[PDB]
Structure formats: C-alpha cells, structure tokens
Amino acid sequence: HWGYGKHNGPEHWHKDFPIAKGERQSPVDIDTHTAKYDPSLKPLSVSYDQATSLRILNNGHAFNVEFDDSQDKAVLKGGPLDGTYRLIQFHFHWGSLDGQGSEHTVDKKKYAAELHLVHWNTKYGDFGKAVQQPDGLAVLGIFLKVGSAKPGLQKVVDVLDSIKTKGKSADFTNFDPRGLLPESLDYWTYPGSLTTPPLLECVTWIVLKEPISVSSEQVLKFRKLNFNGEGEPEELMVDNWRPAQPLKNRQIKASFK
Ligand SMILES: NS(=O)(=O)c1ccc(NCc2ccco2)c([N+](=O)[O-])c1
Ligand code: NA
Ligand SMILES: [Zn+2]
C-alpha cells in the first residue's frame, strides 16, 4: 500500500492512482513574482467559534484531528469560494529536519511543516459526494517555521505520546483551531488536488502567506510518531510530504497587493 518510503512513496503512486499525473495535481511551487493580485478575491471568512473537535487519529501517514461535521459549526467561506465549506479535519505534513516538510513551496523555499484544514462544500451533502466534484473541497494551508512556540499547538503536541502508532486514537474534544492561525489571512489560491492517494482533483487551495512559528521542541515531538503499527519495527513518521507537481494550465492568484 502507498506511503512515503522509497518503494511506496510519491514516485510510485501513479501505478494505482493514475490521476497522480493529472492536470490539476497538488502541491505546487508558488512563484511569488508571477502570482497576480486579483482584486475580485474576497477576504477569507474563517468561522471556527463553534468548532467541535472530537478525536485525534494516527492513520499511518499523519495524525488527523477530527471535527463534528454534522452541522455548519466550523465553516470557511469567502475568498475564492462560492457557498459554504464545513471543516472535517486537520492534519500536518513535516520533515525529518527543519529544512523540509512543507508540500507547497514559495519561490522554491520549503518550510518545516504545513498544516491543512480540510473543508467540504455543503451543497453536496456529505464529504463522500463532495470528492466526486471539481469544487467539492477547500483546503486552507498554513506554513510552519521553527522559532517561538505556538501556544495553541501545545495541546496537540502533548497528546501525541498516546497515539504513537498507526491505528491509535484518543479523545480530543474542545480543541480550538483558531489557535493555529497566523495574524494575517492574506493568501494565494489555485485549483488542485488531494496531496495523498486517491489524489482526487476536487480542491480549491487557499495557502496563507504568513507562516506560524512553532518551537523546535514542538516539531521534534511530531517526529517521534510512528508510521508503523504497535508491535512492528519502528519507522519514524517523518517526511510525509509530496513534492511540488507541475503547474500545467493553471494560474495562482494572490489576495493581496
Ligand atoms: N493532504 S490533503 O489535505 O490534500 C488530504 C489528502 C487526502 C485526504 N483524504 C483521502 C481520502 C480517502 C477517501 C477520499 O479521500 C484528505 N482528507 O480527507 O481530508 C486531505
Ligand atoms: Na500568474
Ligand atoms: Zn495534507
């Protein structure tokens, strides 16, 4: 099955998932000098006050913080989006060292990690139907650099010991994702895909320009997770990122001048 290693990683995914070579794959490099300001783009409306987190899961690839998406409790709208997109989960991608880990790059710069807040378009009723649509998903991407600690991340860091291996989960109620945002909501946007199999081309990507800072100790704890299950040889969960893919016939738009 797919993963991030030499024999099952991104260079192999196309065999089982031929859309890996498709026309709107993610991530991409954001070439900042050619991303054109679009004055018709609206401010992003992130409404997370009523978010209800439920659980955190090590799925063998990353960890997902899952939300109650049976009502419009945490939603993303505005920006490039038409309608309303409901938060279902967030997760991260990160590196073995601070100089890599992000999926998107900015003028070829790799950040230490990247946070993805995943939302589905409520006009399709359920996530499974949304991922059959070219405008089914909106993913808010936020870069992480290593510096000062992010206070709102520490509750995540501290539960990771309890979900070390694939298939382990823990209660994770009352987590406020507002604590993971940067100050500015300036963004770049483009049409793309999921960055892991099944690589479905359903995503409006919204990538924030301002990184959040996390401490070295915080990211070091991400790197103590395991890809393997309990009682299997230890494979540290590091370098769970897909490299940049060809931009093809797409334009990245900037929300800011
Ligand atoms: N790195 S990402 O934000 O693009 C991403 C990748 C895969 C999946 N899911 C994979 C999957 C299984 C069935 C359909 O879809 C998700 N997600 O679900 O939020 C997000
Ligand atoms: Na452009
Ligand atoms: Zn992701």
From Swiss-Prot:
Localization, per the record, is: Cytoplasm; Cell membrane
Mutagenesis or variant effect for A62S? 2-fold decrease in enzyme efficiency, as determined by kcat/KM ratio, and efficiently inhibited by chlorzolamide
Pfam families membership? Carb_anhydrase
Looking up InterPro entries in the UniProt record yields: CA_dom, CA_dom_sf, Carbonic_anhydrase_a-class, Carbonic_anhydrase_a-class_CS
Q: Which UniProt keywords apply?
A: Acetylation, Cell membrane, Cytoplasm, Disease variant, Lyase, Membrane, Metal-binding, Osteopetrosis, Phosphoprotein, Zinc
Result, substituting T195 to A/C/H/P:
Strongly reduced activity
Q: Indicate the impact reported for E103 to A/Q.
A: Strongly reduced CO(2) hydrase activity
Effect recorded for Y4H: Reduced proton transfer rate
Query: Catalyses which reaction?
Result: hydrogencarbonate + H(+) = CO2 + H2O; urea = cyanamide + H2O
> So what does mutating E114Q actually do?
Strongly reduced activity and sulfonamide affinity
What GO biological process terms are annotated to this protein in UniProt? angiotensin-activated signaling pathway; carbon dioxide transport; morphogenesis of an epithelium; neuron cellular homeostasis; positive regulation of cellular pH reduction; positive regulation of dipeptide transmembrane transport; positive regulation of synaptic transmission, GABAergic; regulation of chloride transport
Query: What molecular functions are annotated in GO for this chain?
Result: arylesterase activity; carbonate dehydratase activity; cyanamide hydratase activity; zinc ion binding
State how changing T196S affects the protein, per the record. Answer: Enhanced p-nitrophenyl acetate esterase activity, but normal CO(2) hydrase activity
Outcome following mutation: N59D: Strongly reduced activity
Q: How does it assemble?
A: Interacts with SLC4A4. Interaction with SLC4A7 regulates SLC4A7 transporter activity. Interacts with SLC26A6 isoform 4 (via C-terminus cytoplasmic domain).
Give the misc comment.
Target of drugs used in treatments against glaucoma disorder and breast cancer.
- Which PANTHER family does the protein's record reference? CARBONIC ANHYDRASE (PTHR18952), CARBONIC ANHYDRASE 2 (PTHR18952:SF120)
What is the name attached to this protein's record?
Answer: Carbonic anhydrase 2
